[PDB]
């Protein structure tokens, strides 16, 4: 549904994963930062699109980026 | 006065003291020189 | 309106409303019409008068011609 | 266990904490970095729960803030008595009040505003006041302006005492948490000591001061030759010539011969035909009764003397089969959360202020209150707006209790847990009754507008068309008029004149009150009122119930109260917060209270307020057009919003032209609100970025970065200008129209 | 000029003086002649008569409404309507703009530059509010020396 | 790598808030493979409220 | 990492009933089951609205959304020291285990997971939309 | 309450107010309704004659109506109201 993209400006601060309320983001190993980890979005079909990860990203400009695309019953947040 | 004058130098107090002086001046201009539509000088 | 463009209100179209009472039928009858009509405030009478259209048959022929033009398009 | 817990000198009285502005919050103590720091400085200024997690210092902050509020109200009362003493015509109005308008504000002759000092009468120029202070001082027995100056300087003394107590109960001896948690003692000393002894003391004033002076004012005696209030206490024969029951001298009180006090303690009812205001023998019996009843009710709870009630024992014994473990933990709610008690107290104070508004147009308590129509409209309108604001704030602090003080571990299977457990049912059935009320009142208005537009006056909801007579109200008004004969014997007359007992009271040639008719128009506008109150309840109760979580956002309590949104996800989570429900309930309070005061103004300008000529003919201000024009929106726009606005727009060049200026400036503040309400932060942030670029070009960049207002702040600014502009529009239109035709 | 009669010879402007005193004289009829509110209306009448004798003596132009109209084109007769108080204004408005600009330069080279804007340093402020008197000689002096404007390489610019 | 620690640099990154702004370098990572090693501290915060950001040496010049 | 199997014999927390629970999306589309092991009998805030007494052993809670499982799960990870996992249950009977996928929570890094949805460029090096007209690819997915 | 043997009983698929009674009428009443409502069964057939039959039945009484039945077919019954400026 929603497309969440991680860019190489990430410092591995992990707070995009901690702010995620639908378990989209996970921290995979990486070689481009001091923390040696970058975020990724394997369960991007579960993304509501709330951009809590973009609110918690301290990198200017943002490393996690959520693009609101086709919206399904996962990304609409319904219970009915 | 190391901190009382610091409070008196804050943004709302200095706006109140300046605009109190500013509106105090412009009212007193408008008493002795009222209805001023054209500057004669 | 072509006979007297100063004292005749230009009529747009007739009104067929099932919700009118008799005051609404008697009050919307303007311009010397047989029923309740809408007064045209679009300036189409002034336009068609200045351009050369005089009778209702000329306006009907123009309506058929522009039906044909829209059909061609 | 109830006793005084204070401790000495918690914080030192120093100005070094005045110099640092954001000392209360950890985020604002680092100093400013953007221009949003200034707005969070004011937003978190009074929010004492966000400062510290210790409820003891929070309660001390709230207690000294109460004392500062009391100091501000005593400064305000000092000003209004000093304005009566020096800048009023209160002695001139008190000589004859049927021709001289009440005025207590003189403007300075500076810029052409000296035309606002209008001819109010009595050889006086000033702003005609509508606050009702003149009739209040006439009911208090105030005869001279020296008494007003003495009350002003006494109020200044009490304002200094409240400032001293606010300093004392935060910096010298501040109470501890268990002192504030003695709610049984606080209720015992508020019911008996505050509302009981206050009613008893005002009853003593209304026995010795208000009653004989106001009896002499009904006799046409000049107030300069009326004896002073202490002369009735000293010379009791002077008090006995007006009431012979004073000749016995306190022996019927202790021998239970209270009927011998029937000369000055009566259950008359109705209005004084001399003045148009309630009797003070009834207002003194009223205060003596609510004092001998609030002092009884103040001996109910258990403090430390054995007798009484633990209210936890009252609550925990109140449990039912439809609830199970209900009412348990609500004592722990209402003694550990300031916001829950604030919600209950604000709901009662707002609803009570609405009670005050109705029980003052209908039973006018002050002499020449009813016949001064400006005072009646302004007092009703002011108390409706205060009451609506306080009930919206009640729902606000209910929601703040949910997001910041509701502990789910202590509340299992009680009333609050089960109300949260079926909040979908509450909000959905409230939604149904709101939509049903909206169609069955406003669509009835739309139907009347449509058939009046289509030339079908018989197809409407009129008194001549399909009738919708309020048979329950028309029966309860007959039940309240035909009461003295059988269900309430000992009454000389009836409770109010608006019930149907006759008594066309004419004071000064102007109608005080008469029987108020209730027809199809009153039915329609009362269903509008019920609809608007229900919708305000719907947004506000939805914000209270969905403050913790929702089906949309299950972690909404972690986001807080003043958060804008979660984001553009789940379709968009804009205005999910409980704050945003308070924000929308402020608009629905505008809608509700504005239609309430519009129905009030038109209903009594059409059916109550007017003049009486010879041979008993009553000519109202807008004669009889409420029954036929207030059933359509075109009548409300035409015979109310256009016909009665023909004195706010042509008041220019007169004393009421400031009402025209504030009418137009109130339209300005309303259209200014629509800038903040309809727009959003990011547009203004990029426009400010262009302005910051222009400042960078000319080296006038501030180090405090210019930022757009926050989304919560932009909505707050928009609703503040919407309420301020619309309320000031109605204030200007009301206070120009009813002053002009009054 | 522009079809407007002068206000000293305008019959409509003298009509508005006649109907303004007559409104105030009828307000005076219901007061005692030595009373305190009658002294305010008597001071209002003398304020009105001073106003109408000031507008006619300045060469103001009155239209068909009897109202003084301002000619802002830059006429040699009409300098005090727009040009003379405009130059008086822009001197005062440039004084506000120069002492606020010079305050920000003086606090940008400080230890905490953001605490000097919420808490304005009055000895630093008042020593340059006097210096804003001679500001056209200091604004064009900074314009000619290049210190007024900042080069675009050191200015924060949003991307395309 | 990096220009210098404790030096004044100007950001050439287009999408940063501090583009064409004076910043102070506080840390340069000398580990290979790091894309943005130079840590630059700024006197002014961005809209997120932070002043610490990592840039490559290609996006900075000494000023 | 072997995913845990849903036992379907552990019991529910003591809850009086809520109207915020499973609607017809549970019946035809999906519903979410969260299973966690408890130290003792506690009281927790229900993400549908309300409070329930959680059991002294393993607990099973049926939820409608994936966000309700994280809102509950982060509540009993910070207030309580309880490890949790949840599932996705479909109406045909298939139970899809969802979190944590490697057995360790996604805040902590694991060597088994791979980078997906990761761009080696930044935002400023994304291509303009004018040079990607009429293509399935967009400015960020390449 | 999860079972893995009955997926409908653990998800809310309950006939909350349903009944399993086979019949409660008699054969005489049942044969009358299916005979009369036998040409109204098919959705594609019923949508055809309801649109075509519904368009005719509003055009019939729209046209055969009288002056007292509907005011729009009554027409004006008084002198027309002349507007301002002689129009
Ligand atoms: C930018 C708009 C603007 C401009 C050009 C002026 C300028 C003027 N107004 Mg002003 N005025 C304005 C906005 C404006 N006004 C607004 C917003 C208000 C409402 C608060 C007023 C209400 C006002 C008052 C009440 C008075 C002035 C007066 C004056 C004069 C000031 C003379 C002096 O020494 O002091 C001058 C002609 C005074 C005057 O001489 O009137 C001509 C005077 O009576 N004005
Ligand atoms: C002059 C005597 C004095 C001094 C030096 C102090 C010292 C202190 N007070 Mg205060 N206090 C005093 C009198 C004093 N107080 C009184 C009279 C009250 C009763 C209101 C209290 C109650 C009190 C509370 C409850 C709190 C303190 C605290 C504070 C600290 C700084 C707060 C601050 O910034 O104040 C500056 C504040 C102001 C200038 C605002 C004053 C507002 C007044 C009441 C007027 C408001 C209405 C006014 C008419 C404006 C209306 C709007 C207008 C546009 C019309 C500091 C230790 C705080 C503290 O220690 O916590 C960290 C705290 O929370 N004080
Ligand atoms: C019989 C004693 C008594 C009485 C008269 C009151 C009266 C009052 N209380 Mg108090 N209170 C008492 C005992 C009493 N209290 C007890 C025992 C408790 C402890 C459990 C509390 C704790 C409590 C708190 C925490 C607060 C109050 C507040 C209030 C005020 C109500 C708000 C208001 O605007 O009212 C109308 C206000 C007035 C009429 C002003 C009257 C002020 C004068 C000086 C009397 C007050 C002094 C004292 C209480 C009684 C002295 C009597 C004296 C006249 C001889 C009012 C001053 C509230 C407040 O505003 O805080 C300041 C507040 O929330 N009370
Ligand atoms: C708190 C209110 C209050 C207070 C302070 C007073 C004060 C007074 N009353 Mg009382 N009185 C009150 C309530 C009050 N009364 C009420 C509500 C009633 C109705 C029962 C009266 C009716 C009353 C009578 C009938 C008389 C007094 C009298 C007295 C005086 C002597 C008793 C005394 O001081 O003790 C004193 C001036 C006596 C007096 O001297 O009259 C002035 C007197 O004869 N009182
Ligand atoms: C008994 C009265 C009472 C109590 C104790 C409080 C107490 C509080 N309120 Mg409030 N509330 C109430 C009633 C009250 N309120 C009412 C009347 C409303 C409806 C408007 C609400 C709605 C409510 C909401 C929506 C929220 C609170 C919150 C707050 C908290 C701090 C707000 C702050 O720092 O002030 C800030 C003060 C200002 C910004 C001053 C602005 C004043 C108004 C808005 C504009 C000016 C109006 C003025 C009359 C017009 C003059 C114009 C002229 C100057 C040109 C505090 C707990 C906030 C919170 O976080 O609670 C924890 C918040 O989010 N309140
Ligand atoms: C005149 C303007 C207007 C109108 C028409 C509406 C209409 C509605 N508002 Mg309101 N409201 C408005 C302005 C308006 N609002 C603004 C200013 C705000 C922003 C603050 C709000 C925000 C809002 C809130 C936040 C809430 C409402 C809700 C509602 C509903 C109330 C129930 C009702 O009356 O149903 C009857 C419907 C009508 C009277 C609309 C006219 C329909 C006519 C009568 C039917 C005939 C037409 C015909 C079928 C055409 C063919 C209704 C749909 C409430 C809601 O949805 O729950 C009940 C709700 O909670 N309002
Ligand atoms: C310190 C003084 C200072 C200086 C020299 C200027 C000068 C500049 N500003 Mg301004 N401005 C300032 C204060 C200052 N401003 C402040 C305090 C604010 C907030 C109200 C703004 C808000 C602002 C806006 C909204 C706009 C400008 C713009 C402008 C330009 C034209 C002047 C103008 O539009 O009228 C002045 C505009 C105002 C809104 C009046 C604010 C001036 C206040 C009263 C001065 C306060 C100074 C004092 C020391 C504190 C110019 C580059 C425009 C631009 O982008 O450049 C072309 C523009 O769009 N400014
Ligand atoms: C009566 C109203 C004045 C009350 C002042 C009380 C008070 O703050 O002063 C009591 C203050 C307490 O002194 C405080 O001491 C602190 C260090 O501990 C800091 O220096 C504070 O600036 C200083 O206010 O005593 C003073 O030194 C008086 C000067 C400040 C009062 C100025 C009044 C204007
Ligand atoms: C107003 C009256 C509405 C009747 C309500 C009334 O009579 O309440 C009766 C019932 C009382 O329940 P219990 O017997 O559990 O109450 C014991 C009380 O002490 C509550 O603790 O209240 C409810 O269950 C609420 C039902 C509201 C139903 C929707 C009404 C809206
Ligand atoms: C000064 C100045 C100025 C001016 C200003 C202007 C421009 C104006 C605007 C304004 C407008 C254009 C409007 C406004 C309006 C107002 C208002 C509106 C206000 C109000 C206030 C208040 C305070 C209120 C009160 C109230 C209330 C609260 C409630 C009830 C009612 C009332 C009313 C009583 C300028 C800038 C030039 C310059 C500088 C200075
Ligand atoms: C206009 C507007 C702004 C911009 C509003 C701003 C920047 C507030 C302006 C406040 C004053 C005018 C600036 C600060 C004034 C200083 C005290 C300096 C004094 C200068 C003069 C006022 C004397 C928003 O931020 C916004 C956010 C969300 C929805 C709508 C809107 C919105 O409509
Ligand atoms: S929050 Fe931003 S910087 Fe931190 S790990 Fe996530 S993407 Fe990287």
Domain map (residue ranges) of chain F? 1-63
CA dihedral D350, D356, D359, D361 (to 10 degrees): -110
| Residue nearest atom 41 in ligand 7 by C-alpha distance | E97
Phi–psi pair at D599, nearest 5 degrees: -60, -40
CB contact (8 A) between residue D697 and residue E150: yes
| Chain breaks after residues in chain G, where C lies over 2.5 Å from next N | none
Q: Using CA atoms, how far apart are residues D452 and D458, in angstroms rounded to an integer?
A: 9
Resolution of this entry, Å: 2.8
Sign of CA dihedral D25, D31, D36, D39: positive
Binding-site positions of D for chlorophyll a read: 675, 683
Domain residue limits at A66: 1-80
Q: How far is the CA of D577 from the centre of ligand 9 (A)?
A: 29
Task: Determine the Cα–Cα distance for residues A44 and A68; give it in Å rounded to an integer.
Answer: 11
Region at G50 (left for phi over 0; alpha for psi -120 to 50; beta for the rest): left
Q: Which of D57, D541, D66, D550 is nearest to D343 (CA)?
A: D541
Q: How was this structure determined?
A: cryo-EM
- Alpha carbons D400 and D543: distance in angstroms, whole number: 10
Answer yes or no: do C19 and D455 touch at CB < 8 A.
Answer: no
Asked if H36 reaches chain G (Cβ–Cβ under 8 Å), the answer is: no
For chain C, the maximum distance between any two Cα atoms, rounded to a whole number of angstroms, is 45
CA dihedral E73→E74→E75→E80, nearest 10 degrees, is 110
List, as one string, the DSSP characters of chain A: --EEEE-TT-----HHHHT-SSS--EEEE-SSSSS-EEEE-TTGGG-----HHHHS--SSS-SEEEE-----TTTTT---
Closest to D609 measured CA to CA, from D374, D354, D379: D374
Nearest-CA residue for atom 25 of ligand 6? D584
Q: Which atom of ligand 7 is nearest to the CA of D690?
A: 55
- Domain coordinates of chain B in residue numbers? 1-41
Using a CB-CB distance cutoff of 8 angstroms, which residues of chain C are in contact with residue H76? 25-26, 29, 34-36
Longest dimension (CA), chain H: 88
CB C28 within 8 A of CB C63: no
D392 CB under 6 A from ligand 5? yes
Rounded Cα gap, residues D263 and D271, in angstroms: 17
Q: Which ligand 9 atom is nearest residue D326's CA?
A: 21
Rounded Cα gap, residues G80 and D546, in angstroms: 24
Q: Which two tokens stand for residue D221?
A: 């005696």
d(CA E94, CA E134): 10
Q: Is B24 on the interface with D (CB under 8 A)?
A: no
- Chain-centre distance of CA D305, in angstroms? 37
CA distance D359 to D224: 33
Q: Which ligand sits closest to the CA of D317?
A: 9
Helix (H) or strand (E) holding D230: helix D229-234
A16 at the D interface (CB within 8 A)?
no
Write the CB contacts of C57 (distance below 8 Å, at least 6 apart in sequence): none
Q: How far apart are CA D591 and CA E132, in angstroms?
A: 51
For residues D455 and D460, give the distance between their C-alpha atoms in angstroms, rounded to a whole number: 10
The separation between CA C5 and the C-alpha centre of its own chain, rounded to angstroms, equals: 13
Q: Which residue in chain G is spatially nearest to A9 when comparing CA positions?
A: G122
- Minimum-distance ligand 9 atom for the alpha carbon of D327: 21
Of D654, D622, D650, which is closest to residue D638 (Cα–Cα)?
Answer: D622
Q: Which one of the ligands is nearest to D2 CA?
A: 3
> How far does CA D438 lie from the centroid of its chain?
26
Give the integer Cα–Cα distance in Å for F9 and F25: 7
Is there a cis peptide before residue D525, judged by omega within 30 degrees of 0?
no
Q: Where are the domains of chain D?
A: 1-742
Q: What angle do CA C66, C68, C73 make, to 5 degrees?
A: 95
Q: Is A33 annotated as a binding residue?
A: no
Structure tokens at E128: 């340059």
Fill in the DSSP letter of residue G118. B
Task: Provide the 3-class DSSP secondary structure of residue G81.
Answer: coil
Q: Note whether E136 and E98 are within 8 A (CB).
A: no
Name the domain count of chain A.
1
Q: Residue D709's closest CA among D681, D736, D734, D678?
A: D681
> Which member of C16, C30, C34 has the closest CB to residue H72?
C16
CB D126 within 8 A of CB D103: yes
Any idea which ligand is nearest the CA of D12?
A: 2
Q: Which residues contact G128 (CB under 8 A, 6 or more apart)?
A: G139
Kindly state whether A79 is in contact with chain F, defined as any CB-CB distance less than 8 angstroms: no
Question: How far off is chain D from C25, nearest CA to CA, in Å?
Answer: 9
What is the torsional sign of CA F47, F53, F57, F61?
A: positive
Beta bridge partners of G62: G33
- d(Cα D268, Cα D212) in Å, to the nearest integer? 17
Interface probe for A, chosen from G28, G47, G66 (most Cβ of A below 10 Å), is G66
Rounded to a whole number, what is the distance in angstroms from the first to the last CA of chain E?
51
Q: Does H9 touch chain G (CB under 8 A)?
A: no
Task: Characterize the bridge pairing of strands E61-62 and D6-8.
Answer: unpaired
Calculated CA dihedral for residues D429, D430, D431, D436, nearest 10 degrees: 90
Give the whole-angstrom CA distance, residue D143 versus residue D89: 12
For ligand 6, the distance from its centroid to the CA atom of residue D580, given in whole angstroms, is 18
What is the CB neighbour count within 10 angstroms for residue E85? Answer: 17
CB A52 within 8 A of CB A24: no
Any known ligand binding at A57?
A: yes
Instruction: Give contacts of G127 with chain A, Cβ < 8 Å.
Output: none
- Nearest Cα of chain F lies from the Cα of D33 at a distance, in angstroms, of 7
**Degrees, nearest 5: CA angle E61-E65-E66:** 55
A36 close to A12: Cβ distance less than 8 angstroms: yes
Closest CA to D563 of D552, D574, D571, D554: D574
Residues of A in contact with D555 (CB under 8 A): 21
Two tokens at E150? 């900042």
Q: How far is D454 from D451, CA to CA, in rounded Å?
A: 5
Shortest CB distance from F20 goes to which of E113, E155, E160? Answer: E155
Atom 60 in ligand 7: which residue has the minimum CA distance?
Answer: D691
């Amino acid at each position: 549904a929603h497309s969440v993209k991680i860019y190489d400006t990430c410092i591995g601060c992990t707070q995009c994963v901690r702010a995620c309320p639908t378990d989209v983001l996970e921290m995979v190993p990486w070689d481009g930062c001091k923390a040696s980890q970058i975020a990724s979005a394997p369960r991007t079909e579960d993304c509501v699109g709330c951009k809590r990860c973009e609110s918690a990203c301290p990198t200017d400009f943002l490393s996690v980026r959520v693009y609101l695309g086709a919206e399904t019953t996962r990304s609409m947040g319904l219970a009915y | 006065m190391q901190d009382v004058k610091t409070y008196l130098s804050t943004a709302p107090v200095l706006a109140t003291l300046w605009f109190g002086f500013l509106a105090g001046l412009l009212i007193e201009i408008n008493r002795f020189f009222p209805d001023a539509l054209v500057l004669p000088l | 309106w072509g006979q007297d463009p100063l004292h005749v209100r230009p009529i747009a179209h007739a009104i067929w409303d099932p919700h009118f009472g008799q005051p609404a039928v008697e009050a919307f009858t303007r311009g010397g019409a047989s029923g309740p009509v809408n007064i045209a405030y679009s300036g189409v009478y002034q336009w068609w008068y200045t351009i050369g259209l005089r009778t209702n048959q000329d306006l009907y022929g123009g309506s058929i011609f522009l039906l044909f033009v829209s059909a061609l398009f | 266990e109830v006793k005084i817990m204070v401790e000495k000198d918690p914080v030192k009285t120093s100005f070094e904490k005045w110099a640092k502005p954001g000392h209360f919050s950890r985020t604002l103590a680092k100093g400013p970095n953007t221009t949003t720091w200034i707005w969070n400085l004011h937003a978190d200024a009074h929010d004492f729960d966000s400062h510290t997690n210790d409820l003891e210092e929070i309660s001390r902050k709230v207690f000294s803030a109460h004392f500062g509020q009391l100091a501000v109200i005593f400064i305000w009362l000092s000003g209004m008595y000093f304005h009566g003493a020096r800048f009023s015509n209160y002695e001139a109005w008190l000589s004859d009040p049927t021709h001289i308008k009440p005025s207590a504000q003189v403007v300075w002759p500076i810029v052409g505003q000296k035309i606002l000092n209008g001819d109010v009468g009595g050889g006086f120029q000033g702003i005609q006041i509508t606050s009702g202070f003149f009739q209040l001082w006439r009911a208090s027995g105030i005869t001279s302006e020296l008494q007003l100056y003495t009350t002003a300087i006494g109020g200044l003394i009490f304002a200094a005492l409240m400032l001293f107590a606010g300093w004392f109960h935060y910096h010298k001896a501040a109470p501890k948490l268990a002192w504030f948690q003695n709610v049984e003692s606080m209720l015992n000393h508020h019911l008996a000591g505050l509302l009981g002894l206050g009613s008893l003391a005002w009853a003593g004033h209304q026995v010795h001061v208000s009653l004989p002076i106001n009896r002499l004012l009904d006799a046409g005696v000049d107030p300069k030759e009326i004896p002073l209030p202490h002369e009735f206490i000293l010379n009791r024969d002077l008090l006995a010539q007006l009431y012979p029951s004073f000749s016995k001298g306190l022996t019927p009180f202790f021998t239970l011969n209270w009927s011998e006090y029937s000369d000055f303690l009566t259950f008359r009812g109705g209005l004084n035909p001399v003045t148009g205001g309630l009797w003070l023998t009834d207002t003194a019996h009223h205060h003596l009764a609510i004092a001998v009843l609030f002092l009884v009710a103040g001996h109910m709870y258990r403090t430390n003397f054995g007798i009484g009630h633990s209210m936890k024992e009252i609550l925990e014994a109140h449990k039912g089969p439809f609830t199970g473990e209900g009412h348990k933990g609500l004592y722990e709610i209402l003694t550990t959360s300031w916001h829950a008690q604030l919600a209950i107290n604000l709901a009662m104070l707002g609803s009570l202020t609405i009670i005050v508004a109705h029980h003052m147009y209908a039973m006018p308590p002050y002499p020449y209150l009813a016949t001064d129509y400006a005072t009646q409209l302004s007092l009703f309108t002011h108390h409706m707006w205060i009451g609506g604001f306080l009930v919206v704030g009640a729902a606000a602090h209910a929601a703040i209790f949910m997001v910041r003080d509701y502990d789910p571990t202590t509340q299992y299977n009680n009333l609050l847990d089960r109300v949260l457990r079926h909040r979908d049912a509450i909000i959905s059935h409230l939604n149904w009754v709101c939509i049903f009320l909206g169609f069955h009142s406003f669509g009835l208005y739309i139907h009347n507008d449509t058939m009046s537009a289509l030339g079908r006056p018989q197809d409407m909801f009129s008194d001549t068309a399909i009738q919708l007579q309020p048979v329950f109200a028309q029966w309860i008004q007959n039940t309240h008029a035909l009461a003295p004969s059988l269900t309430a014997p000992n009454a000389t007359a009836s409770t109010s004149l608006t019930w149907g007992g006759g008594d066309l009271v004419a004071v000064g040639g102007k109608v005080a009150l008469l029987p108020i008719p209730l027809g199809t128009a009153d039915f329609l506008v009362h269903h509008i009122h019920a609809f608007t109150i229900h919708v305000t309840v719907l947004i506000l109760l939805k914000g209270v119930l969905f403050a913790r979580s929702s089906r949309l956002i299950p972690d909404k309590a972690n986001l807080g109260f003043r958060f804008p949104c979660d984001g553009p996800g789940r379709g968009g989570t804009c205005q999910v917060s409980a704050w945003d429900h308070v924000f929308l309930g402020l608009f629905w309070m505008y809608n509700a209270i504005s239609v309430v005061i519009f129905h009030f103004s038109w209903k009594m300008q059409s059916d109550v307020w007017g003049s009486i000529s010879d041979q008993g003919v009553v000519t109202h201000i807008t004669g009889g057009n409420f029954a036929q024009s207030s059933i359509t929106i075109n009548g409300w726009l035409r015979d109310f919003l256009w016909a009665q606005a023909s004195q706010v727009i042509q008041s220019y060049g007169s004393s009421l032209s400031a009402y025209g200026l504030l009418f137009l400036g109130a339209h300005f503040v309303w259209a200014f609100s629509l800038m903040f309400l309809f727009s959003g932060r990011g547009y203004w942030q990029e426009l400010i970025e262009s302005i910051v670029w222009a400042h960078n070009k000319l080296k006038v960049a501030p180090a405090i970065q210019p930022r757009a207002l926050s989304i919560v702040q932009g909505r707050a600014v928009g609703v503040a200008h919407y309420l301020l502009g619309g309320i000031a529009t109605t204030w200007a239109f009301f206070l120009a129209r009813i002053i002009s035709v009054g | 000029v522009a079809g407007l009669t002068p206000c000293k010879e305008s019959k409509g402007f003298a009509k508005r003086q006649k109907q303004e005193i007559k409104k105030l004289e009828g307000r005076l009829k219901l007061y005692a002649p030595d009373s305190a509110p009658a002294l305010a209306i008597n001071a209002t009448i003398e304020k009105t008569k001073r106003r109408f004798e000031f507008y006619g003596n300045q060469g103001l132009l009155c239209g068909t409404d009897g109202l003084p109209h301002l000619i802002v084109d830059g006429d040699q007769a009409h300098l005090g309507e727009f040009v003379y108080p405009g130059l008086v204004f822009l001197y005062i408005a440039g004084w506000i703009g120069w002492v606020g600009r010079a305050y920000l330069i003086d606090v940008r080279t400080s230890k905490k530059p953001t605490e000097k804007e919420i808490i304005i340093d009055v000895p630093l402020a008042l020593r340059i509010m006097s210096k804003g008197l001679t500001w056209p000689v200091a604004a064009i002096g900074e314009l000619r020396s290049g210190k007024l404007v900042e080069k675009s390489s050191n200015i924060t610019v949003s991307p395309r | 790598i990096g220009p210098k620690r404790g030096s004044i640099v100007k950001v050439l990154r287009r999408e940063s808030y501090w583009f064409n702004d004076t910043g102070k370098v506080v840390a340069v990572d000398q580990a290979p493979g790091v894309r943005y090693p130079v840590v630059v501290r700024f006197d002014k915060v961005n809209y997120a409220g932070v002043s610490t950001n990592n840039y490559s040496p290609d996006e900075l010049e000494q000023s | 990492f072997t995913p845990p199997t849903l036992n379907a014999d552990t019991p529910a927390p003591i809850f009086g009933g809520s109207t915020g629970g499973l609607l017809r999306k549970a019946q035809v589309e999906e519903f979410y089951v969260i299973t966690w092991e408890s130290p003792k009998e506690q009281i927790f805030e229900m993400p549908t609205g309300g409070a329930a007494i959680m059991r002294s052993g393993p607990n099973l809670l049926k939820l409608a959304r994936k966000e309700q499982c994280l809102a509950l799960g982060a509540r009993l990870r910070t207030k309580f020291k309880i490890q949790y996992q949840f599932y996705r249950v479909f109406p045909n009977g298939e139970v899809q285990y969802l979190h944590p996928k490697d057995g360790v929570y996604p805040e902590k890094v694991n060597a088994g997971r791979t980078a997906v949805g990761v761009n080696n460029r930044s935002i400023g090096q994304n291509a303009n939309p004018a040079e990607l007209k009429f293509a399935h690819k967009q400015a960020y997915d390449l | 309450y999860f079972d893995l043997g009955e997926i409908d009983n653990t998800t809310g698929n309950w006939d909350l107010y349903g009944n399993d009674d086979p019949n409660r009428y008699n054969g005489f009443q049942n044969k009358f309704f299916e005979t009369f409502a036998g040409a109204f069964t098919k959705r594609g057939l019923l949508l055809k004659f309801l649109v075509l039959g519904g368009a005719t039945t509003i055009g019939y009484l729209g046209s055969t109506s009288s002056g007292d039945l509907l005011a729009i077919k009554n027409g004006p019954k008084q002198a027309p109201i002349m507007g301002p400026r002689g129009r």
